Each structure stands twice: as structure tokens, then as C-alpha cells.
Design a protein around this ligand. Sequence first.
Ligand code: CA
Length: 279
Amino acid sequence: AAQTNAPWGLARISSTSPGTSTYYYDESAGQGSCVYVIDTGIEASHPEFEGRAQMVKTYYYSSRDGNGHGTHCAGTVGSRTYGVAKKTQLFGVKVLDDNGSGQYSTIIAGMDFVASDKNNRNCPKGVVASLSLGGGYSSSVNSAAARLQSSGVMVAVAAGNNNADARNYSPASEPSVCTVGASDRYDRRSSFSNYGSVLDIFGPGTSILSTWIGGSTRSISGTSMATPHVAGLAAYLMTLGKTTAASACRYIADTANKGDLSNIPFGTVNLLAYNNYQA
Ligand SMILES: [Ca+2]
């Protein structure tokens, strides 16, 4: 399948080179997979989600996304125009309030929720969780991320936006999950992207167009935006049967574009998520 004039991130994920604008992907498109977006929620009524999005949990007085961040992220995972996995099922877990803030205890609870809740969902091709959030190092937060992964969920987490080593952030520093740095459309490490040995992969994160609340769209930037590219990629690869929740981060690293990013600090992986799709 070919989607012309796609957001640059989508085009990049299916390309061996920067500077193209068509997104190429197998038409299976993550059908039969599920992706949990653990964030400010998802505006499920957005036309871009086509009925494939649902709020399953909130820790606040509403499950509505009163922010937009969670909706943007979900849109990159699986919206029809802005998504990597255009046929995946999207589940929203609101651990962040409408200011984008959340106590670590609520974040942990949301992770443990998804680890159980996948048993209440129909996801024959496999389960992914996208966590575009973080804060300072916490062993409890990392442990929760490690549980969710161990349970059979491909966990993708943002490296963080401090232009700093991600070892000092959580869940970014958890070894057993997929930690995702950000790049721009010129294959530069995004200026705000964290780095370090704990990173597993890079995805597009600068100037990323996706869904927003009020049924709109916008371009914003962050390792928050890179993460859902990787989560969507994992869902897509799982429906194709190429990989599984346990091995998908390795598989993505294995099949990544290698050595192509600039301003990657010494000792950080130079790997850019790539679907290796041959149209
Ligand atoms: Ca990791």
C-alpha cells in the first residue's frame, strides 16, 4: 500500500533515505493487534480513528482527553491519515491529567492495569503499549514497565526531552522495555532528545503532524512523538507475523536504518525505526 503526501515521519519509517513523502506499508496495517496509549487519554470520536479507538481506563474524574497530547500520540500509532498501523485497535488509559501531569503512583497503576486488561481485549496478533511520559529515575516506575513487558506487552517508552542521558529518567532507563529517542526530517537527532546506552531505537519526533482534540490536527515535537511511531511499527510487524511482544524491540533494532543519524553521542545507538517494507 502507498499513502502519498504522508506526514514525513511515516514516509521516513518506510524509507532507506530521508527526504521522501510517501508512506509504504503492508495493507494488513496492524489489523488484529492492539495498542494501549497510556497518556492524557484519546478523543475516540475523532473521525481519524474510525471507531477503532476506545477509552478503557481513567484515574481522574473524566476519561476525556482535555489536553490533546494523548490524542496526538494515538493518532501517530493508528489514525487513518497520521498513523503507522492504520487498522490497529487503540485503547486509551488516562494516567495523565489535562495538564499532562501524573503522580508516579497513578502511572504505575495504569501500567499494571494494561498488563491485566489485555486479557479482556481481543488482540490475536499481539499487544503493544505506548508510554509517552516520564520523570526522574524511579525503581518502582521501571519495575512497573518491566512487569508490563514481562506480561506479554511490547512496551515502548519515550527517552525524554532533556538533551540528557536517559539513564536518569523513568521508565526510559528500564532495560527490558523499548526506549525511543527522537530524530528530525533531516536525520539529525532532535535537539531535545535524550540519549545514552539505555536507548534502543530512534523514531521521528520533530514537527510531527497528527490528530488533536476538538477533531483537529497539529504538528508538535517530542520523544513523545517518536514513541508512537515505534509502538505502531511494532503492532504492524506483529500482525505481519515478523515478531512478537517479547522480541519486537530487538527486531526493530535489528532491521533499523543504521549509522544514518547525525549528532548521535558516542555510545548511543545510531538506529532509526524502519519497516523494511518492499512494496
Ligand atoms: Ca531499554
